[PDB]
Amino acid sequence: SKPLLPIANPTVLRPANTFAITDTNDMSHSLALSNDTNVPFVKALDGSGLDEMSFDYLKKIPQFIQSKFFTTTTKPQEVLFQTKVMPHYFVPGGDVTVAMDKDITRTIWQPSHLAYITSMFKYWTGSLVYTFKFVKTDYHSGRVEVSFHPFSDYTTGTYSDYTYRIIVDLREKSEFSVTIPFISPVPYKRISRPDWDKPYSKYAHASTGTLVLKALTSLKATNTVVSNSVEILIEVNAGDDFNVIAPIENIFFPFSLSPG
Amino acid sequence: MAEQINENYENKQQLVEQTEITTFENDLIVLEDGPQMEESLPFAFHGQHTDNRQHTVVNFLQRPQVIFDSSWASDVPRNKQFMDSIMIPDDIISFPMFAEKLKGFSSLRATAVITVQFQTQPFQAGRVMLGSFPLPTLNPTRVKFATNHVSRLMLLNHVQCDIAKETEVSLRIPFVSPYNSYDLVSKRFPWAKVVGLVYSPLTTTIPVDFIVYGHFEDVELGCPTSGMLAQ
Amino acid sequence: MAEQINENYENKQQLVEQTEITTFENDLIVLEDGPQMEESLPFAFHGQHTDNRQHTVV
Amino acid sequence: SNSGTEQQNPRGSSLLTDPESITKSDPYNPNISLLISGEVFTNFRNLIKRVNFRKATTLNGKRISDTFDINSLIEAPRLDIAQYVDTETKEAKYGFSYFWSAPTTLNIVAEMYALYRGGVRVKVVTEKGVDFVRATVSPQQTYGSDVAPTTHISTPLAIEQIPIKGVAEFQIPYYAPCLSSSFRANSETFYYSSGRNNLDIATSPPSINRYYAVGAGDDMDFSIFIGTPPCIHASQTAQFTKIKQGKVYDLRYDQYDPFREVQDGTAFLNARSIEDSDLL
């Protein structure tokens, strides 16, 4: 035959498909035996059907973020623990501390599990789950008050009776874990460099509010059989609606180590 | 098939008797004799030497085996070990109960179960963490950074114990490897390194004692082998 | 039977778990954890290390 | 309830169910990521498809080849300690450095896992005047021979023409004996769990600078969660201490990305990669 052909649609040509995009198509060459040679997805390699790669699995893993004490010298209404409500923290003592010279040592503060996982994004949302462990016996005793102040600080003139709180009687009880909801004027808050020693009024863009663990009582204990100190162990979990968007940031660069 | 017309040699397909593993294929004649009309004594007459049960080689692996039996005082703080590290399954199958049975097998694919006991009179406090780093010989770069600190172990697969609440604790570690099984003849590619840290120190002088048990479930034993390598 | 009227101690008949040979009988609490929703790979994926047979001690 | 004697939130329980809300009501808000972001993020398996620049080959000559291991790209690059000496006052200042390297989107995810499975995607950017770029994989080790060949006759070849397609995109499959392979360094030598492969990028005419950007192939999958890696603060890139001959940036980096400015930091004097035994 061999007849002519009508003109086609005007095209526009690129050097590469868009690096930025997750989907659509890729122009690479296949160095395999055939094109679109792919390895089938095999699940439960880790022994469980939980997709260990899923964000909704990783985010739900508890992690210790700070320790406090609760003693027989604690006054009532004394704050034991006070944090901005935010997913990203620093690891307490798990710093990377390398020697530079015979006597110069430097310390890199290391990221929370949530801090690392949200490190590449820009905004977050959803409820968080704060767990409190009390390493004690059935023969210590104490009331703590976990009150969630959604928009404000805990300062002078801050009555905790306005806020969803839980007054837990720690006689036999030993642990405590609440889901702190996402209450904010913004559908998303900012991921940031974590700062323990900041109020909420600063970092107002990265936190929803402040949560406070407050003593209602001194720690009751007979000194001849049990101790006077009891360590508060705080963990952070990331709820179920915890959603994270806008992947145009980096707060933490990872590196690998060299074998020694 | 290349066709073969044989009339001088019998296709002696009998005189071929496999006995479990060994196959004899014989020419001339096979003979067998003994006392004829064999009976057996009923079980009341003997059987005072056995239990009313049978033990395979899969149990003997499902039996708990004591690995550790020790203590730890109040001098060890958070993020420090209270028990020695355990290689799975090297520090388990090296005990004679298991090793005598795994011998004659190529490999092992099973989930391992590490159970730990804890002794507490109700006046003692503290918490303790038991985690497992997968495949420590394949990623040695990352072992000691994921196990020198609590909150990098507990986001791994871990199990905690409140000293004044839990008297037993058992972590189930499923088999996981780039491979199908765990080479027994060369002991290559252990699938976890159990490490034990202190989540919070003791509050009294009285140390705490602990027993570490280890067994396997979901056991798939490999092919029979001699199991000896050159050196 | 000598009759016994107990109301301060639970007949903790659980926390009693025999594992083939060894019997644990426990007080306080027994805990057990691991990766949840465990599956197994089908036999084509592994099983190049075994024969299609099992060997007992008999 | 929220408190009690049993462990109120163990790991195995956190993966499945959340504790009661402080409100004793429904604490959940509906997902509206698609309504504000315009897109939904749920799995890192998709996010690793994003390609970012990973390494650069500068310190060789005008060559026509550049061979290097593939699994080393799934690792995050080594962090190095840089010794700086003041050309005037002769006291030492000390910082951190990525030697002609940087991590990728891929490397942020891969460092949380133990094994990998699937193909790696490599895209190259070259200097001007280069006409072609060719990619080939080879086994790095002819097993049982003290030396490996310098050519091959049945290996894959893939040619991209720069002046008509400026980025040379290649996809390197998964060729390893095992189900899922390993990508980090080890001392195992009896038999191997990694698929050890080379990758040879050629340029016609021969050139000096090769810029490599890496990303996840479609079939990319990681296996066992192990934990968060050792990290460095991103803000440490802009912090610097001034000395006589110039600036000393806490996180020093090279022109690994052929599209980033060259930071005005003076060259160091010695480099030492942080070993696992250096951690205190």
Short mmCIF file of C-alpha atoms in Angstrom, two decimals, chain A residues 50 54-61 87 114 124-130 178-182 236-244, chain D residues 9 13-21 26-32 41-42:
data_model
loop_
_atom_site.label_atom_id
_atom_site.label_comp_id
_atom_site.label_asym_id
_atom_site.label_seq_id
_atom_site.Cartn_x
_atom_site.Cartn_y
_atom_site.Cartn_z
CA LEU A 50 1.46 -6.26 58.93
CA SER A 54 3.04 1.17 55.91
CA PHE A 55 3.02 4.58 57.56
CA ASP A 56 -0.06 3.51 59.53
CA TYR A 57 1.98 0.69 61.06
CA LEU A 58 5.18 2.56 61.79
CA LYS A 59 3.36 5.45 63.44
CA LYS A 60 1.74 3.20 66.05
CA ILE A 61 4.94 2.06 67.83
CA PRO A 87 4.56 13.90 67.67
CA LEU A 114 7.84 9.86 64.99
CA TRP A 124 0.89 16.62 60.53
CA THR A 125 -2.50 15.95 62.12
CA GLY A 126 -4.33 13.36 64.17
CA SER A 127 -4.51 12.14 67.73
CA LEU A 128 -1.53 11.10 69.83
CA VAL A 129 -1.24 8.46 72.55
CA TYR A 130 0.87 9.30 75.61
CA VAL A 178 -4.54 8.01 76.94
CA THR A 179 -5.34 9.02 73.39
CA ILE A 180 -4.96 12.80 73.26
CA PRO A 181 -7.15 14.11 70.42
CA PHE A 182 -6.26 16.61 67.75
CA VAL A 236 4.67 8.45 72.73
CA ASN A 237 2.47 6.65 70.24
CA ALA A 238 0.74 8.19 67.26
CA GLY A 239 -2.95 7.39 67.38
CA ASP A 240 -4.91 6.01 64.43
CA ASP A 241 -6.02 9.09 62.50
CA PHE A 242 -2.45 10.41 62.42
CA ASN A 243 -2.07 11.86 58.94
CA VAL A 244 1.01 13.53 57.49
CA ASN D 9 -0.23 -0.09 76.00
CA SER D 13 -1.42 -3.83 71.37
CA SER D 14 -0.39 -0.44 70.02
CA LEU D 15 -0.17 -1.83 66.47
CA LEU D 16 -3.88 -2.67 66.50
CA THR D 17 -5.88 -0.62 68.99
CA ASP D 18 -5.61 2.77 70.69
CA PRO D 19 -6.38 3.40 74.37
CA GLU D 20 -9.52 5.19 75.46
CA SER D 21 -9.65 8.90 74.78
CA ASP D 26 -14.55 9.42 69.87
CA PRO D 27 -11.17 11.20 69.54
CA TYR D 28 -10.77 10.76 65.78
CA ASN D 29 -11.11 13.34 63.08
CA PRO D 30 -11.70 12.28 59.47
CA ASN D 31 -8.89 12.02 56.98
CA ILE D 32 -8.81 15.16 54.82
CA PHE D 41 0.25 9.43 51.74
CA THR D 42 -0.09 5.99 53.34
#
